[PDB]
Amino acid sequence: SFSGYLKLTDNVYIKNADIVEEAKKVKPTVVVNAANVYLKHGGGVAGALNKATNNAMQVESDDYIATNGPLKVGGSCVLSGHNLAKHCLHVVGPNVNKGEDIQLLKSAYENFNQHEVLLAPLLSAGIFGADPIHSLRVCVDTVRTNVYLAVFDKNLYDKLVSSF
Ligand SMILES: CN(C)c1ccc(C(=O)N[C@@H](CC(=O)O)c2ccc(Br)cc2)nc1
Predict the structure, then answer these.
(1) Which residues have a Cβ under 8 Å from the Cβ of 108 and sit 6 or more positions away?
(2) Spans of all domains in the chain
């Protein structure tokens, strides 16, 4: 069902796209959220995915945190995909703007290996403060399952492809 992606490796594909619009079109089995440990979906990819669910993602997430407590940086949980996907894999990459350890980015991407195919953003990019070129390299060197990366910024997409 994924179309228009550029093949980077045997299992990693990339496209300049809005992940909300991509999820609505494909209805993938798994969409990845760029979550924080509290599952507070305020901004970035998480704010956009939650807004597209009419806040149902945040209501489910608040019940999950009330029962389980916060996730670990580098960890994940599987919740509903609502109207976007069958499932949402909420993955916590390190937030460099909060002083978190960038080495945890490889542990964050290892969560993707529990799912055969995923629609995902680049972890720790954007408002999480990491270098997206680095994030793409860790993705390619860590994920072994089939990952379809949606890169929102056209200018960054071009830089990622040309420097790969
Ligand atoms: C509205 N939603 C869907 C998004 C909100 C935010 C983001 C997001 O921060 N994306 C990252 C990586 C990327 O482009 O994918 C980013 C954006 C701009 C610059 Br400049 C640098 C990095 N991605 C999506």
Answers:
(1) 73, 74, 75, 76, 91, 92, 93, 94, 123, 124
(2) 6-161
**Among all chains, which residue has been given the structure tokens 């990459």?**
93
Indicate whether residue 152 lines ligand 1 (CB < 6 A).
yes
**Atom in ligand 1 nearest the alpha carbon of residue 151:** 15
Entry field: residues in the chain: 164
- How crowded is residue 41: how many other Cβ atoms within 10 Å of its Cβ? 23
**Method for this entry:** X-ray
How far apart, in Å, do the first and last CA atoms of the chain sit? 25
Q: Is the CB of 151 under 6 A from ligand 1?
A: yes
- HSE (side-chain half, CA atoms, 13 Å) at 5: 23
Task: Give the count of beta carbons closer than 10 Å to the beta carbon of residue 145.
Answer: 14
Asked if residues 61 and 79 have their Cβ atoms less than 8 Å apart, the reply is yes
Domain 6-161: assigned CATH number? 3.40.220.10
